[PDB]
Amino acid sequence: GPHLLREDASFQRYGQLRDNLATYWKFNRKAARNVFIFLVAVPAGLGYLAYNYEGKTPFVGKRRTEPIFEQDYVPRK
Amino acid sequence: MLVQNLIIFNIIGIVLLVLLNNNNNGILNKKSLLTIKNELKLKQIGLIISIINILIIIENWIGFNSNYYGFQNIERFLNIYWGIDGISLLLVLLTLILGPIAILSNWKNLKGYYTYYVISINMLVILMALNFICLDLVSFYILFESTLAPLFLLIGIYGANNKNKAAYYVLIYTLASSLFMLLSIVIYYIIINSTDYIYINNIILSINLQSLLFIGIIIGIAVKTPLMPVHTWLPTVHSESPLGGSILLAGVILKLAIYGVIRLLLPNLSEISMMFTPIIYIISILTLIYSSLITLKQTDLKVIIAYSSISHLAVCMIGIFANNLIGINGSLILCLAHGFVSPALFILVGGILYDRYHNRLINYYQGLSTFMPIFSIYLVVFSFCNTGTPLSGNFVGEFLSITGAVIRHPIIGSLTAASVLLSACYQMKLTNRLTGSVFSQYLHITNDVTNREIFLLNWLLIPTIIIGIYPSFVTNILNLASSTLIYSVLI
Amino acid sequence: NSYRAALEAGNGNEGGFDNKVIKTERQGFWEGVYRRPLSQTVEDLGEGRGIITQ
Amino acid sequence: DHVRSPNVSFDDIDYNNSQDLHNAQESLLREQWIRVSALKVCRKALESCYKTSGPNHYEDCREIAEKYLNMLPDHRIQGFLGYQKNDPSK
Amino acid sequence: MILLCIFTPFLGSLISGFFGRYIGVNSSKWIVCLSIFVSVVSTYILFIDVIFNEIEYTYNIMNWLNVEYLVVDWSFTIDKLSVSMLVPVVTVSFLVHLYSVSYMSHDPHQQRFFSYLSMFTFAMIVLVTGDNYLILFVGWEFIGVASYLLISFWFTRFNAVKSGLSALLINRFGDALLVLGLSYLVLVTGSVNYNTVFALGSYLDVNMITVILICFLVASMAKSAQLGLHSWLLLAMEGPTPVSSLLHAACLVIAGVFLLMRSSPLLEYTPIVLLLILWLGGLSTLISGLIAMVSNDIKKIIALSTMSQVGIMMIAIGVSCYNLALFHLICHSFFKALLFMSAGSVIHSIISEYQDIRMYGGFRQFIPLAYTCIFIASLSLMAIPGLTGFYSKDIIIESMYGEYTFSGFIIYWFALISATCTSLYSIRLIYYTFLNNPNSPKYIYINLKENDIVLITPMIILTILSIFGGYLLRDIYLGMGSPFNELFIHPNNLSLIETEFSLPSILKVLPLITGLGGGLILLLIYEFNYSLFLVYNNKNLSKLYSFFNQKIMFDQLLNNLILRSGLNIGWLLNVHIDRGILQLFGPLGLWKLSTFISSKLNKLVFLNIGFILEIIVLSWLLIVFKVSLLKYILLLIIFIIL
Amino acid sequence: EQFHLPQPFWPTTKTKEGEYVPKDSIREASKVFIGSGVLLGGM
Amino acid sequence: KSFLPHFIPKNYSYGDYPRLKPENLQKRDPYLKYDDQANKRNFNEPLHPQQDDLDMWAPDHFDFVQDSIALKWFGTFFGVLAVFSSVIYIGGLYPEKPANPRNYPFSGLAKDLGASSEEDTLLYAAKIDKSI
Numbered sequence A: 001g002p003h004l005l006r007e008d009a010s011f012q013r014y015g016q017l018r019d020n021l022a023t024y025w026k027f028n029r030k031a032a033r034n035v036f037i038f039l040v041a042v043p044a045g046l047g048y049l050a051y052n053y054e055g056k057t058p059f060v061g062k063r064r065t066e067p068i069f070e071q072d073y074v075p076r077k
Numbered sequence B: 001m002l003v004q005n006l007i008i009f010n011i012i013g014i015v016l017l018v019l020l021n022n023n024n025n026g027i028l029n030k031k032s033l034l035t036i037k038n039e040l041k042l043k044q045i046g047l048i049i050s051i052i053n054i055l056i057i058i059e060n061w062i063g064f065n066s067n068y069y070g071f072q073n074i075e076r077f078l079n080i081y082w083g084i085d086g087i088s089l090l091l092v093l094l095t096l097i098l099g100p101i102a103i104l105s106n107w108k109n110l111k112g113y114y115t116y117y118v119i120s121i122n123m124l125v126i127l128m129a130l131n132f133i134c135l136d137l138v139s140f141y142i143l144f145e146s147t148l149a150p151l152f153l154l155i156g157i158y159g160a161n162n163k164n165k166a167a168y169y170v171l172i173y174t175l176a177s178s179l180f181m182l183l184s185i186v187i188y189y190i191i192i193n194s195t196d197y198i199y200i201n202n203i204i205l206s207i208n209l210q211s212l213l214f215i216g217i218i219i220g221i222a223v224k225t226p227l228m229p230v231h232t233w234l235p236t237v238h239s240e241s242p243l244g245g246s247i248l249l250a251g252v253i254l255k256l257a258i259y260g261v262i263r264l265l266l267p268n269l270s271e272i273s274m275m276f277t278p279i280i281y282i283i284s285i286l287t288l289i290y291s292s293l294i295t296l297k298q299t300d301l302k303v304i305i306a307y308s309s310i311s312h313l314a315v316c317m318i319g320i321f322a323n324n325l326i327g328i329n330g331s332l333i334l335c336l337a338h339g340f341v342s343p344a345l346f347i348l349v350g351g352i353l354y355d356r357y358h359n360r361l362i363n364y365y366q367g368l369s370t371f372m373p374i375f376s377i378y379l380v381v382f383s384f385c386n387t388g389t390p391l392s393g394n395f396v397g398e399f400l401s402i403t404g405a406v407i408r409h410p411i412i413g414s415l416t417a418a419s420v421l422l423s424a425c426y427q428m429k430l431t432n433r434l435t436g437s438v439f440s441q442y443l444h445i446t447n448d449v450t451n452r453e454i455f456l457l458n459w460l461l462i463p464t465i466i467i468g469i470y471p472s473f474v475t476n477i478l479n480l481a482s483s484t485l486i487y488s489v490l491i
Numbered sequence C: 001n002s003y004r005a006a007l008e009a010g011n012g013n014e015g016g017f018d019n020k021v022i023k024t025e026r027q028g029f030w031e032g033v034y035r036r037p038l039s040q041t042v043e044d045l046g047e048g049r050g051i052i053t054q
Numbered sequence D: 001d002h003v004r005s006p007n008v009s010f011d012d013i014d015y016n017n018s019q020d021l022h023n024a025q026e027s028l029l030r031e032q033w034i035r036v037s038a039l040k041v042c043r044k045a046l047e048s049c050y051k052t053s054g055p056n057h058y059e060d061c062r063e064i065a066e067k068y069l070n071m072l073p074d075h076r077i078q079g080f081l082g083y084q085k086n087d088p089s090k
Numbered sequence E: 001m002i003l004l005c006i007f008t009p010f011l012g013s014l015i016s017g018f019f020g021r022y023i024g025v026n027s028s029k030w031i032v033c034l035s036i037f038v039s040v041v042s043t044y045i046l047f048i049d050v051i052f053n054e055i056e057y058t059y060n061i062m063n064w065l066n067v068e069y070l071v072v073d074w075s076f077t078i079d080k081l082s083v084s085m086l087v088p089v090v091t092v093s094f095l096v097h098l099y100s101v102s103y104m105s106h107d108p109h110q111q112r113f114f115s116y117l118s119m120f121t122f123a124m125i126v127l128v129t130g131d132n133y134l135i136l137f138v139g140w141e142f143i144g145v146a147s148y149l150l151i152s153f154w155f156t157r158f159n160a161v162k163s164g165l166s167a168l169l170i171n172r173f174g175d176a177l178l179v180l181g182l183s184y185l186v187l188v189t190g191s192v193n194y195n196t197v198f199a200l201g202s203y204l205d206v207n208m209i210t211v212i213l214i215c216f217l218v219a220s221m222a223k224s225a226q227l228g229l230h231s232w233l234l235l236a237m238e239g240p241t242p243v244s245s246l247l248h249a250a251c252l253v254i255a256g257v258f259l260l261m262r263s264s265p266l267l268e269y270t271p272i273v274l275l276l277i278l279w280l281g282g283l284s285t286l287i288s289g290l291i292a293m294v295s296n297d298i299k300k301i302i303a304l305s306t307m308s309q310v311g312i313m314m315i316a317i318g319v320s321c322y323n324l325a326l327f328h329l330i331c332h333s334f335f336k337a338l339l340f341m342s343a344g345s346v347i348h349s350i351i352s353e354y355q356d357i358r359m360y361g362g363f364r365q366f367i368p369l370a371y372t373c374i375f376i377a378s379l380s381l382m383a384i385p386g387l388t389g390f391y392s393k394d395i396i397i398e399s400m401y402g403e404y405t406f407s408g409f410i411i412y413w414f415a416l417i418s419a420t421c422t423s424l425y426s427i428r429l430i431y432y433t434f435l436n437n438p439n440s441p442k443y444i445y446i447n448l449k450e451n452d453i454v455l456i457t458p459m460i461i462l463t464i465l466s467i468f469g470g471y472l473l474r475d476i477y478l479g480m481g482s483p484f485n486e487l488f489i490h491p492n493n494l495s496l497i498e499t500e501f502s503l504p505s506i507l508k509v510l511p512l513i514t515g516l517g518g519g520l521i522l523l524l525i526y527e528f529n530y531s532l533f534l535v536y537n538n539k540n541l542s543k544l545y546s547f548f549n550q551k552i553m554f555d556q557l558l559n560n561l562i563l564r565s566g567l568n569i570g571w572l573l574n575v576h577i578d579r580g581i582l583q584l585f586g587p588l589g590l591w592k593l594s595t596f597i598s599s600k601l602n603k604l605v606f607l608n609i610g611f612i613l614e615i616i617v618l619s620w621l622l623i624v625f626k627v628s629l630l631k632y633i634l635l636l637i638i639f640i641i642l
Numbered sequence F: 001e002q003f004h005l006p007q008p009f010w011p012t013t014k015t016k017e018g019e020y021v022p023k024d025s026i027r028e029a030s031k032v033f034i035g036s037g038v039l040l041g042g043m
Numbered sequence G: 001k002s003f004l005p006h007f008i009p010k011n012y013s014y015g016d017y018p019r020l021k022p023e024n025l026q027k028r029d030p031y032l033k034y035d036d037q038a039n040k041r042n043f044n045e046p047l048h049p050q051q052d053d054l055d056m057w058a059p060d061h062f063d064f065v066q067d068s069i070a071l072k073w074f075g076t077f078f079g080v081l082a083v084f085s086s087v088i089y090i091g092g093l094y095p096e097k098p099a100n101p102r103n104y105p106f107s108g109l110a111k112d113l114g115a116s117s118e119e120d121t122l123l124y125a126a127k128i129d130k131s132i
Ligand SMILES: CCCCCCCCCCCCCCCCCC(=O)OC[C@H](COP(=O)(O)OCCN)OC(=O)CCCCCCCCCCCCCCCCC
Pocket: B461, B462, B465, B466, B469, B470, E061, E062, E063, E074, E126, E138
């Protein structure tokens, strides 16, 4: 109605660019390094913890079967 | 008679709103009483009906037993069996409550065609409500894709500048994916000769045929709830869709996928779910971590909240795929909690700020607490609720889902705790910026929050706190129903 | 390998299901059963997170 | 009033009779919540014993805590699909 | 008398928050102070019954979680350890509230400052009164929410709005690990109740016990501002002085130590964690004492003083001497709260309202009351014999050598350096502000006076407690054989006997001898031989000074290399994934492919009899070819599309 | 012990041991190259 | 001296977006007249594409010393402490215990520490007094 927001010309170019980054993206050898890390390194990275330890962690009330405290003190002398 | 009353009433209501408005087209100029005051006499009818639908489920609620195992209120209408259990009762109840708030949110910020808008909202609300109370895979699909027809037209007619881009995204992403679910639904109808829930819950399939069915159904779920890497449609849709569309989309529609896991995967593909559960956790946890880092480097106001909803829907999927009652109950509570906080944020961001200043760039706004104190109060409170504050309902969902994951997989499920830290960064950085430093020089001082906008926030905040302080209103109903999904043999 | 060819050879589910007849040999691709040997679940799902042990 | 649990083991029924199969699923559930409740009572003793004993809680609550840890792994909702869809004898 | 002690500040906090507009300003500050005063009285009544008459209280309101075996109730128990935390919190917070009435008299927003300030007090009371670990977490989170509002109170100041976010987020990093630790408590034990969990400590595996308490330790590092997460502690000075007078004495700062003390039944059976706790304290005590000596701000020095003194409580935990740490926590809540209030009165007294200590000098005659409060506090902070600091600080350092281990010996020197450094920067602060030639304009001194009675009353009350309180409360906590089973000390870890008997005489006086000798030596150099302390000559001494003055560069390493790097990862996902490959494998990529293919197809639709004739004849080759060659024709047909 | 991953594969006619008489790729590929060379060349 | 924050590109080619080298607005002079005085930005100034990491709301950038200089000093500080700790451990210079560790009767309170039978004993017992 009364244009309560004092529109800034250079803000619009900023928002217009930030909403259209995908147009100017090019699949070079650097974008290929970041795609690999984020989609094939990390997902496979957690793809081994999620399977090397799946069904191998019986932690519910895991009792203690080992002494903790030393019984015989041997001085260095 | 729930469904029979529910469909017939809305169909009667749709015809009533059709008759009163479209009778005056004729050859005469629109000098009519009904359209006086922006069709106020045709909006009020639409708002009354959405309130009445809430009264229909309550009539069948008082008869609902919280202890009997199985589907209740089993009724046959249109040769389809409709039933209600513990999980379907709360999701239907939540869906209908968001009806009136969706209409009331766009009460005075449309350029015209309020009668069309009202009918579109009601059809979306009823079809969503009916989706939780069906009893076969085929009927689940019908109400899982019928919403596309009103939703595609609602966004295009009542959208933002990029509505054309978003109207395609909602229509094609939810059809090119759900079709992959039609294949798996059809395979059940071929080898079993029925898609009824109870019939297919008791049948075990070969180890391979469960995987082929799981993939076909998980594809239609991983898209409906935005899960990486097919999440690239919701942020566009949320930015362009109207306030009524954004409230329903992230309030109920995205929770259909969580409910879709309950009906379509856990009971009948129980073995293969245990095989896929480690895979789901890697996909979900990276969705949580990425969708919270991506939100840091955003600029658009409504897109920022759009990615926030994705993170809190990754926590739901992590919890639901846990094989214990702790994970499953918290995942369902979080869906209920996220069914009020997420719509509330779109009212603050895209329903109050946008409706006055007509822009969505985070660079303009800052220090709004100087001349909009009431807006800040609900901005801070709904920000702390959305981050997992203990007194909110998000925490109860977020604690139990995180705890439920740890029980299933203590190692990778520990990374689910990242939601506690990550949700604080992108969210408060928005709340800190919107309410910090001197009042912005680009914004003129305008009216503060009005009575209508206050009402929505107060009735979207109270259910969130009530569930947070005392979630036994919700847990008690779910405890029997959620205990059926669990698959384990202990010797 | 199609369902129709498998069905016509007795590999389908035409006669319904029963749970007393527990097949030791692995079922066919399209075949459905009410109940399955535990050893087959242990071979597929593996022992661990709630199968046999906790 | 207080409806009881229709004790029906899966091995006695034929799954085709849907009414029977519902009973064997409900019965297995309702006998699993009783075990969780008996866990709560057992743990309700451990809390009272620990506070009243004080420094003596390592000897006056030894068996109660020992039983609680022994019963903890399997006193939780397990569901019926685990035993319905599996036959342990094979 | 329990329910009154807990929820009274909440009622006072809400009255000013919502009814504050209707009850003015002055009538809104005193009601909030009234609500806290009720809680102060009720705490002493409980303290009389709990510690002396061995009565415990518990008010179970209603259930909170009832998901299968996991049951959590909104209950608040008040046992010996809980009351020993209510004494520092509730008493100081009332004095901070009493102090803030006349400190914040000129602030335009007073009905809001006391709304959050008391809400902070209630958020701490819930923390130290929950009877299960989850209720503790409800309080634990709301220290951060209350602090975030209070630290960023002046939301029109950029350095203060950003400082609130830094204090909120780093704590959430601690809270992220606390949630994870709580989950492993439900996994291993099935509940988060103190009674259930602590009764199982000797029967649970060490590795499962270690995993939980490492998470608690990371949660505690954020709150107690220990090494690696201490950047927020100094950035919190952007809030009002009463906020620093409350957060850094008996509040948010100390909340890390209380969590580790409460977990004594679990912490005992994991020697590895107690080693990590001990080593964090020694480094944090050593580093903070060094940074404080070259800082040039009155509130930074005192803020760094707390981090050193909190670290002393950490090393006392690491030797399984939980009683010593709790007792030193209570003492430190009085001779460190008094420092902030008195320092907050020095800044108020001067009309230029400077905070840099290099613009002060010769204030002793002009404001002798504010000097006297600092001097008594400073001696207590220096553990001079006879005062409260001596009865608490020395014994902790005594027991660093009293464990007679390698790790115990190393931390002893780190404590001993920080024991001396405490005596060195304390003299520096007083000399730079009370015994130095004037630096401020002469117009200030003819207006440099004292403050009103309201601002003076709390400081005198704390001044007395900073002399006598340590002596009166020593035998309750540090007595020989006092029954304090709320804190568990394993029989193999009772080294209090060797500490108080086998230490040579030299150790018992060594911190004082270096403290008194080092302070006087520095005092002469500052007065008669100040030419040495111009560090711009020796480039080695200039680089050293500029190193500790920037706080070990950890602020620069955190901002420029982690937050800056962390934000860049979010930018990479936004560019190469969200707007990157997932847009090439999406609407933007599929528009190119569709436009490419549909361009080829539209050429084929053109009215020509010869064109349609060849394709009809071409299709006759399908019948001729053996049907094993369909896949090749499919490959060829795609080739022709290009 | 290996990993337990899902197996989404449609059934195929499994040629057991002693079956699967190998096909001569050199001759089979010769027919395609010579056959496709004439058709495109002749046309 | 006044290095830019890390991870700031040198050349960006975003279609027709104007090319301007990044300027960190945090280091601008507060005394000059600015339209956006809090953010120290004149009206309608062009913005860098990654300007979110340069304006005031971005994390504060400390440019007092070179980052590799900071790592050098910060690592140097703990190198001395590691040196001091390592030297002592090599020769065992730290004092030895003046007495035997604290002892207890009843087989070192084995039963009092939740030892059911004489088989456990050492699983729970503390140091045991041999002068019973
Ligand atoms: C923001 C806008 C304002 C709107 C939101 C305001 C916040 C909401 C405050 C109220 C929250 C709703 C919960 C109150 C409803 C009572 C819940 C309840 O049913 O209690 C159950 C309790 C025990 O259960 P049972 O034995 O089965 O008996 C009940 C059978 N009908 O049965 C009982 O004996 C009843 C016990 C009633 C206790 C009074 C309620 C206390 C609520 C305040 C304390 C909340 C917990 C403490 C949290 C404070 C922070 C630590």
